[PDB]
Amino acid sequence: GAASTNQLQYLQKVVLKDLWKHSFSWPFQRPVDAVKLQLPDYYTIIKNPMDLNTIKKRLENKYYAKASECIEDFNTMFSNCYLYNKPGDDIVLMAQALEKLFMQKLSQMPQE
Numbered sequence: 001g002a003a004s005t006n007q008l009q010y011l012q013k014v015v016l017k018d019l020w021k022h023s024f025s026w027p028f029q030r031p032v033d034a035v036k037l038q039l040p041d042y043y044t045i046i047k048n049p050m051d052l053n054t055i056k057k058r059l060e061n062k063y064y065a066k067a068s069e070c071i072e073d074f075n076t077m078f079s080n081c082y083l084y085n086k087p088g089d090d091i092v093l094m095a096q097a098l099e100k101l102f103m104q105k106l107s108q109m110p111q112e
């Protein structure tokens with residue numbers, strides 16, 4: 001159908017799916033469980049938490065009106081990781097590799 005429809009479909013069927021399949025996706029597949037991970041300060045520091053499963057559900061639920069809103073959530077997920085953690089941390093390296101894949105898939109976003 002319309003370009004906007006193809007774009008949101010692309011984000012769900014290709015971008016989200018390929019990120020999930022990537023070996024470094026596992027920390028981003030669920031919301032941070034602060035009790036489990038022993039991180040009382042996580043939701044003190046991160047006020048706009050985001051994860052791939054939340055994105056998945058929103059795409060399934062037709063929550064986003066346009067592709068840009070979904071891309072915002074992906075970017076928020078990466079930004080959260082960069083903000084909370086420190087340079088050189090393994091989690092940051094992982095996020096950077098995942099983000100690179102994200103950018104590559106974005107570069108092929110249909111416009112017609």
Ligand SMILES: CC[C@@H]1C(=O)N(C)c2cnc(Nc3ccc(C(=O)N[C@H]4CC[C@H](N5CCN(CC6CC6)CC5)CC4)cc3OC)nc2N1C(C)C
Nearest residue numbers: 026027028032036037038039042080081082084085089091
């Ligand atoms: C949230 C910040 C950042 C981030 O930005 N995102 C997005 C993120 C997302 N997801 C994860 N995943 C996990 C990270 C870690 C674990 C783990 O087992 N951690 C264990 C560390 C040792 C703890 N000890 C404490 C005292 N011990 C002693 C016993 C005798 C009392 C026994 C148990 C138990 C918990 C599991 C994960 O998933 C299952 N990490 C993330 N990070 C990491 C840098 C923490």
Ligand SMILES: [Cl-]
Nearest residue numbers: 023024025026
């Ligand atoms: Cl794994």
